[PDB]
Design a binder for this molecule. Structure first.
Ligand code: AJQ
Lengths: 300, 291
């Protein structure tokens, strides 16, 4: 059977978590599985995002007879409503079910605040707090165990200590290289973030950088100098992973307040073995995040 | 109801943004005459999204993993609207306005800068007279928000030209140091730490006094490569993903300060990563040298 259903029965919109006109994305909190009519459904998050244009698809459309509705016109400039064929109309849909209260908070629209976390702040405040406020990494384990997305793996170094799995993300429809996005997940368990990195991890990091880039060149004919390769801090999930993005893709999470180039991570560890245990890291938090209050009050 | 021309041979993509779901196309028409066609996906309407999702929409499962799954959603015609802008006939000036070249990443070692980049910079006529006019109060003096007048440790804080200051969502100011001869990060030593600390602390305090926005709302960073070779620092609202704030170009001022405190020769010895346009002669010079 063609899989054509959401993973639940019925969708009721509880509230809009966040929408962006410039990004053409919307985050939805839904209530599902309410066949009894008691208004007590499970939580689900549904993310909808319009897709980028495909160059040759739009080129063929413009050379024919497109369906247009005139909006504005003045001298050489004019604006239309275009209703394109089915090919240009697909909407990327991401579902989280069952969604946790943590999922509702991370997607709820909030103003951001910057914070600078010393090595001491991490050990005394952040690390104790995140242990109970972290999302499950079962999806990470499923990929490593070949329990999910095995056919989507682009490259794998199977070594338990220095190996990793290279795989597309949730969003990249793989229809164009302009928005290329892949993630590399290390096989070694227990590496929560940059804070756990030591020179012991230099072989792993070099493997991800050089084998990951070569795999992208082999599979997509995408040269290394077309790629932005980095890590997140704070990471979304506390299992070490690296982001491979097209340089021309203004990818979310590539800002300086979250992204750390993998090549510089390697060189920092080579220059100082205790770099990411002692140095201060700067990142952004939601204004109502209790971790922000804990860090702000310890810094007084 | 139809386009003001017949046929469309794509000459080149002027620019594209997968993040913004927009594309700028240069086409040859009536074959040829020049035309610019801009296509942009439209934002979601909450009512249309709610009505569709509550009533069995057409979906195709891509894959699932634990509690996560991705689908292709095929909405009705009411949600597929594409904003289409046409310039016909388009001029050479229109093409220059929209065209952008692809970006290529490059890593410049300390020796690369001294042997390759700096001789290339010196071979060009890079005028920063407009910078001197601001510092000397001969232009844009009415735009200055704050000044430390010290000739060595001082600076002028000025809003970005593209910020009309009518809202704080896109807050963007620039701090230009008074001291001359500091091309970029490459010229920084611990002797500039008083200047850099002044920019960080006095700059944030001035933005708090003038815009009622405290420091943790701000992203304070420098560019490498900078657009002009006179040291300047960018102050941007954190919620504003300003161009040039990506990891491939921005350097947090606090980290620049602490790097100089940990190693005086940091920015003369360490390798810096940045993007260049594919047609930039500096890109070829660095690639040939690194061969
Ligand atoms: C659960 N899961 C995660 N990922 C990817 O791993 C990374 C997680 S960390 P990141 O900081 O990039 O974003 P994040 O939203 S916390 O990831 P997420 O797990 O919550 S899924 C939401 C998606 O929506 C995108 N997003 C988020 N905010 C915005 C935004 O403001 N604007 C836009 N245009 N896009 C945005 C993200 O890039 C993400 O791809 C992402 O690249 C995910 O795509 C996975 N990949 C595989 N193959 N399978 C998995 O199950 C899996």
């Amino acid at each position: 059977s063609a899989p054509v259903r959401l993973p639940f029965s019925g969708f009721r919109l509880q509230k809009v978590l966040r929408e962006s006109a410039r990004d053409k994305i919307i985050f939805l909190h839904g209530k599902v599985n309410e066949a009894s009519g008691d208004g007590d459904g499970e939580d689900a998050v549904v993310i909808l995002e319009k897709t980028p244009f495909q160059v040759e698809q739009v080129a063929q459309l413009l050379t024919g007879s497109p369906e247009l509705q005139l909006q504005f016109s003045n001298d050489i400039y004019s604006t239309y409503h275009l209703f394109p064929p089915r090919q240009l109309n697909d909407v990327k849909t991401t579902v989280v079910y069952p969604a946790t209260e943590k999922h509702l908070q991370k997607y709820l629209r909030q103003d951001l605040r910057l914070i600078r976390e010393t090595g001491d702040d991490y050990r005394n405040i952040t690390l104790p707090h995140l242990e109970s406020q972290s999302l499950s990494i079962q999806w990470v384990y499923n990929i490593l165990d070949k329990k999910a997305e095995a056919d989507r793996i682009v490259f794998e170094n199977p070594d338990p200590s220095d190996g990793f799995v290279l795989i597309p993300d949730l969003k990249w429809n793989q229809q164009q290289l302009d928005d290329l996005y892949l993630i590399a997940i290390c096989h070694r368990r227990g590496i929560r973030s940059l804070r756990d990195l030591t020179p012991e991890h230099l072989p792993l990091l070099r493997n991800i950088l050089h084998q990951g880039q070569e795999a992208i060149l082999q599979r997509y004919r995408m040269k290394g100098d077309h790629l932005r390769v980095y890590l997140h801090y704070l990471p979304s999930y506390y299992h070490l992973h690296v982001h491979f993005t097209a340089l021309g893709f203004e990818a979310p999470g590539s800002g300086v307040e979250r992204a750390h180039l993998l090549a510089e991570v390697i060189e920092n560890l080579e220059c100082d073995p205790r770099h990411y245990q002692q140095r201060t890291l700067t990142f952004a938090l939601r204004a109502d995040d209790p971790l922000l209050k804990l860090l702000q009050e310890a810094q007084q």
